[PDB]
Amino acid sequence: EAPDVDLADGNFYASREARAAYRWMRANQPVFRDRNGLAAASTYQAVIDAERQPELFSNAGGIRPDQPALPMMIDMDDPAHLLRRKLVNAGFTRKRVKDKEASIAALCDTLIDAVCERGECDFVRDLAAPLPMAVIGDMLGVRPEQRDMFLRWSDDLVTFLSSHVSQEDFQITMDAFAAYNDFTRATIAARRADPTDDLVSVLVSSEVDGERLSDDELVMETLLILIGGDETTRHTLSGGTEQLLRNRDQWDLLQRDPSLLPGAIEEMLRWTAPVKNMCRVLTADTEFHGTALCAGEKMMLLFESANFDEAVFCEPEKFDVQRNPNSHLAFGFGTHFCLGNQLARLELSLMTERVLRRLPDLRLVADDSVLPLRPANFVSGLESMPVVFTPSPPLG
């Protein structure tokens, strides 16, 4: 019998029985309808087939199941989406991202410096959560002592996207946006007058097809980057490292062979799939992999379910840093494929190599049945991950 689940309920994704539910979907009704009738593509095949038909499976209704669209790239269809993405792509060329390596590595070593003498830290609070915010913060011109304010704004906004909030939480979300809007428009004014080499400067100078980004668009697109690149990367760092620590053979492989790190990062992404789903609105009635869908309803793409689809990944519940091929969908697929995928991968690589060498005997304090996942229906991962290691002196 079908699992009795609510795919819009954050508690489903905090359950370590979600993958058992996915497995039933993939085997019995690939395009699944949950207890409330919400449609979701659970197989790798169905997700890809939906991704490849944007004119039928549109982003222009918004990518959350019961929230309207926002005027940002991820809530647009081509050709408007393509122009917006080309404009923002100025901040994410392969050259610009690769050149961040030294600065990201410095942040990684500073963060490890803050705990390496203690012999214990919360891997989430002290390493996985701060790094993505410090990288994005530095791109946006945020003073280091103000990162924590932005981290909380991002948390508030992620949480709004991850649930159906109350009025008090709707108001908190509006307040956080208002504060982010004020900050960003101040930056935009400052950089239109005296350009630097930061993200707002590059986005202001970007030109495509004779077009440029308006102030309104700069705020919206930088907000998408703030939210989209923060707590997502966090959860792959924490959850991916968790799997290295639970399977010591995997930890040991990476420690003795640095050339295995790219493959490890890909398996961390496949396993953690921080973005649990993105929605598509149907533009017409359609029979899709055996399920009738109605014009105007939203269908979820279950990226974690796809990442554990036995039709594509042999023994998907085995964490294997050497997995080849590893064509996971953590970043999605098609025209909306994650714009920050190179930056996310760079953050994950630089922090993980440093964790491996500087905390070489790292181990989890307690096991996973007690480690909670954050209840959220959009982006989710570990709340906390206490770890211990032999102390060492900082690098400075």
Ligand X SMILES: NCc1nc(-c2ccccc2)no1
Q: CA 295 to CA 314: how far, in whole Å?
A: 36
Rg of the chain over Cα atoms, rounded to whole angstroms, equals: 21
Residue 277 to residue 279: CA distance in whole angstroms: 7
Q: Measure Cα distances from 162 to 13, 156, 273, 378 in Å.
A: 10, 10, 15, 5
Rounded Cα distance, 11 and 7, in Å: 9
281-300: contacts with Br ion (CB under 5 A): 289
Q: How far is the CB of 229 from ligand HEM (least distance, A)?
A: 3
287: how many CB neighbours lie within 10 A of its CB? Answer: 9
Residue with tokens 């554990």: 308
- Examine residue 139 and tell whether it contacts ligand X (CB under 6 A): no
Nearest-5° Cα angle at 336, 199 to 281:
130
Tokens of 235: 């959860």
Helix axis angle, 80-88 to 215-246, nearest 10°: 70
The interface with ligand X within residues 148-167 (CB under 6 A) comprises: 161
Determine contact, residues 219/179, Cβ cutoff 8 Å.
Answer: no
**By the rule CB under 6 A, 227 interacts with ligand X:** yes
Whether residue 276 contacts residue 42, with contact meaning beta carbons closer than 8 Å, is answered with: no
Listed ranges 22-30, 133-141, 158-166, 200-208: which one lies at the site for Br ion (CB under 5 A): 22-30
According to CB under 5 A, which one of 85, 280, 336, 374 is a site residue for Cl ion?
A: 374
Helices 130-140, 215-246: axis angle to 10 degrees equals 160
d(CA 2, CA 28): 8
> For residue 304, which of 76, 13, 4, 3 has the smallest C-alpha distance?
13
Q: Which residues bind ligand HEM (CB under 6 A)?
A: 51, 73-74, 85, 224-225, 228-229, 232-233, 236, 274-275, 278, 303, 330-334, 336-340, 343-344
> Is 338 known to sit in a ligand binding site?
yes
Q: Which one of residues 29, 45, 247, 335 is an interface residue with Br ion (CB under 5 A)?
A: 45
Closest CB to ligand HEM among residues 172, 223: 223
Q: Which does 275 bind (CB under 5 to 8 A by kind): Br ion, ligand X, Cl ion, none?
A: ligand X
Q: Which of residues 45-74 bind Cl ion (CB under 5 A)?
A: 60, 62-64
Q: Does 275 bind ligand X (CB under 6 A)?
A: yes
Q: How far is the CB of 296 from Cl ion (least distance, A)?
A: 16
Q: What is the secondary structure of 98-161 as a DSSP string?
A: HTTHHHHHHHHHHHHHTTTTTSEEEHIIIIITHHHHHHHHHHHT--GGGHHHHHHHHHHHHHHH
**Pick from ligand X, Cl ion, ligand HEM, none: which does 374 bind, CB < 5 to 8 A by kind?**
Cl ion
Q: Does 65 bind Br ion (CB under 5 A)?
A: no
Q: Which residue lies nearer to ligand HEM by CB, 299 or 387?
A: 299
49 binds Br ion (CB under 5 A): no
Please report where in the chains the tokens 């890909």 appear, as a residue.
266
77 near Cl ion, rule: CB under 5 A = yes
Strand, coil or helix: 281:
strand
Q: Write each residue from 188 to 207 as x if it is in contact with Br ion (CB under 5 A), else as -, in one continuous string.
A: --------------------
Least distance CB 391 / Cl ion (angstroms) = 27
Interacting residue with ligand X among 18, 131, 338, 351 (CB under 6 A): 338
State whether residue 73 is helix, strand or coil: helix
Query: Does 232 help bind ligand X (rule: CB under 6 A)?
Result: yes
| Residues between 138 and 167 that touch Cl ion (CB under 5 A) | 139
Query: Binder to Cl ion among 177, 260, 383, 388 (CB under 5 A)?
Result: 383
Which residues would be at the binding site for Cl ion (CB under 5 A)?
A: 60, 62-64, 76-77, 80, 139, 199, 374, 383
Which residues would be at the binding site for ligand X (CB under 6 A)?
A: 63, 74, 161, 224, 227-228, 232, 275, 338, 379
Residues making up the annotated binding site for heme are 338
Residues making up the annotated binding site are 338
